[PDB]
Design a protein around this ligand. Structure first.
Ligand code: SF4
Lengths: 148, 115, 95
């Protein structure tokens, strides 16, 4: 339990949950919903401190870009835009206000899409924003510091 | 009151040496000419609301220097001039008689810009 | 500037004032014509955080003239409070 940094609760679309909130919650639909996530398909994925949460959903959000059918513009355009800006987030090539900017477009493609993949993409990044916010700030701080 | 003002600061306008009672016998006159007008007239109720009311302090307070800020109407030598136009105006709508309904309703939707 | 103190004296006495203090022409006091490149600021709403145009809709927020009376006890008012007699300029009242 010490090692695990966060856990994908029930599916890739479901926002990942860290140890801070998942210390007691029951894996049920109702408790997951109030945990700002969903049980979905009960696809629990454990991940420790050694792995970086940004690189974790980096491959996840890259897979989402590799899937979107492109029918409705929010999923066709936003998800790829999400991939590019988040690729910078892996190294940290963004200012602190970009997380709010990333949050904004995450709300923009949430619900506005024809299907639920578009919001299915919003939830994982949205959960990452709300939980590992200081991690993003310090990762970006290291980005500017090492590339001064 | 006090020493008579040499000039009122407006050319053409002259300093009247007896301003308080000049306001008095002017202000009675609009009240007099207002008598002809009907009671239901909107003019009359507004007239008497500011005529004898503002006839109040000028009747009571005799110092025109304090009377400047009693009416917030500027210098007294043009207030009596302004009272003159009100007496003049009262004669004007003794003929206009505007409390009838509209002479003509606005033809179709001429207003309501833009077109 | 060039001008010797002799006729400088002639200008000063005839004009009743010293003109060498300030002259109608220009000299080295003028900023040179190769000023460094500027870094003009950005807009107040240039942030990439919440900046939706749905907030600032200056053209859109305008409303038609408000209907108050149409052809189709009371008190007397004024369109504004009567003006206030401003006082003299404390710096210099009478020219
Ligand atoms: S959200 Fe659904 S419909 Fe819209 S582009 Fe993505 S896959 Fe296509």
């Amino acid at each position: 339990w010490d090692n695990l940094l966060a856990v994908i609760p029930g599916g890739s679309s479901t926002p990942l949950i860290p140890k801070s909130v998942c210390e007691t919650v029951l894996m049920d639909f109702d408790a997951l919903v109030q945990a700002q996530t969903g049980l979905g398909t009960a696809a629990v994925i454990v991940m420790d401190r050694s792995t970086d949460i940004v690189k974790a959903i980096a491959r996840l959000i890259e897979f989402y870009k590799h899937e979107s059918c492109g029918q409705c513009t929010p999923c066709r355009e936003g998800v790829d835009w999400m991939n590019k800006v988040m690729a910078r987030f892996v190294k940290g090539d963004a200012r602190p206000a970009e997380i709010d900017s990333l949050w904004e477009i995450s709300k923009q493609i949430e619900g506005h899409t024809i299907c639920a993949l578009g919001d299915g993409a919003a939830w994982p990044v949205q959960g990452l924003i709300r939980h590992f916010r200081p991690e993003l700030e310090e990762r970006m701080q290291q980005f500017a510091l090492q590339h001064q | 009151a006090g020493l008579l003002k040499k000039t009122t600061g407006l050319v053409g306008l002259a300093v009247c040496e007896t301003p308080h009672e000049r306001l008095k016998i002017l202000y009675t006159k609009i009240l007099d000419v207002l008598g002809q007008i009907p009671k239901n007239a909107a003019y009359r109720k507004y007239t008497e609301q500011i005529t004898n009311e503002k006839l109040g302090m000028v009747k009571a307070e005799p110092d025109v220097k304090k009377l400047e800020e009693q009416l917030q109407g500027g210098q007294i030598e043009e207030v009596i001039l302004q009272a003159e136009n009100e007496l003049s105006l009262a004669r004007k709508m003794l003929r206009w008689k505007p409390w009838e309904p509209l002479v003509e309703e606005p033809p179709a939707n001429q207003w309501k810009w833009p077109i | 500037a060039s001008a010797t103190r002799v006729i400088q004296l002639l200008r000063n006495w005839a004009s009743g004032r010293d003109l060498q203090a300030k002259l109608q022409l220009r000299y080295q006091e003028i900023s040179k014509r190769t000023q460094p490149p500027p870094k003009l600021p950005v807009g107040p709403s240039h942030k990439l955080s919440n900046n939706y145009y749905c907030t600032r809709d200056g053209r859109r927020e305008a409303m038609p003239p408000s209907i108050v009376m149409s052809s189709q006890e009371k008190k007397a008012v004024t369109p504004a409070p009567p003006i206030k007699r401003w006082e003299l300029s404390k710096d210099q009242p009478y020219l």
